[PDB]
């Protein structure tokens, strides 16, 4: 489990400092985005994964992968592919699948 959680730390750090990460650093504010609360049932963002990972609330790397994927699934549910946020989500998702697969 040590190697699981430590690569989780690596990939999370790299997502946090990635150029295209700007939409996903903090929770979406439903007051600012019309219709978000109604459409996205389980919001997720990199700072929430950071909190949980630091507290140790991820038992395996698979749950960490679940939260990251949830970030990008929400992104694609709410945002147009050609929107700025959608484009950044695609760069970040491709990034994450890529970094995940070259380890596991
Ligand atoms: C379009 C709003 C949005 C942002 C957004 C736009 S601007 C910004 C600054 C955050 N501070 C680093 N976040 N992100 C996500 C995941 C959004 C949606 C609706 O899915
Ligand atoms: Mg999926």
The CB of 44 under 6 Å from ligand 1? The reply is no
In the chain, where are the structural domains located?
1-102
Token readout for 12 is: 């999370």
d(CA 69, CA 58): 14
Token readout for 1 is: 């489990």
d(CA 62, CA 74): 18
d(CA 56, CA 50): 10
Please give the angle made by the CA atoms of 58, 62 and 57, to the nearest 5 degrees: 5
Token readout for 89 is: 């989500």
What is the greatest pairwise CA distance in the chain? Answer: 41
The CB of 68 under 6 Å from ligand 1? The reply is no
Give which of 92, 7, 97, 5 is closest to 46, Cα–Cα: 92
Helices 2-16 + 46-55 axis angle, to 10:
150
Method of elucidation: X-ray
Question: Residue whose CA is closest, atom 9 of ligand 1?
Answer: 23
Fold category of 1-102 in CATH = Histone Acetyltransferase; Chain A (1.20.920)
In angstroms, how far is the first alpha carbon of the chain from the final one?
13
Q: For 33, how many CA atoms within 13 A lie in the half-sphere containing its CB? A: 15
Token readout for 48 is: 């929430």
């Amino acid at each position: 489990m040590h190697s699981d959680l430590t690569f989780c730390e690596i990939i999370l750090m790299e997502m946090e400092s990635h150029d295209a990460a700007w939409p996903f650093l903090e929770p979406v504010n439903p007051r600012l985005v019309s219709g978000y609360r109604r459409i996205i049932k389980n919001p997720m963002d990199f700072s929430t994964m950071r909190e949980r990972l630091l507290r140790g609330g991820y038992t395996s790397s698979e749950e960490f992968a679940a939260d990251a994927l949830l970030v990008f699934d929400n992104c694609q549910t709410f945002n147009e592919d050609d929107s700025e946020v959608g484009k950044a989500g695609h760069i970040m998702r491709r990034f994450f699948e890529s970094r995940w697969e070259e380890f596991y």
